[PDB]
């Protein structure tokens, strides 16, 4: 980890991300509100 090293010898961080398609999913996923009038609601899906 020297500053004089070139791009080949410079540190290139690697952080693995692997989304698993297993059986039990996670909630890895909002407007405001109206009071009294005809609207379309997606309340909790």
């Amino acid at each position: 980890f020297r500053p004089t090293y070139g791009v080949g010898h410079q540190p290139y961080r690697v952080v693995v991300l692997s989304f698993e398609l297993l059986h039990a999913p996670a909630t890895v996923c909002s407007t405001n509100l109206v009071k009294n009038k005809c609207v379309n609601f997606n309340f909790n899906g």
Partner: protein, 49 residues
Amino acid sequence: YFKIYSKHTPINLGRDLPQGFSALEPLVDLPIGINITRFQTLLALHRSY
């Protein structure tokens, strides 16, 4: 989904499982799929009689 349906009932009775209706309400849900083909109760009574 390992759903735990819990309801405590502190009712008067001379013998267990008496008469009366008490609906079992859902308390805690677990969204983790595991193969539970066997079962035991962890009973750490210690103070037992």
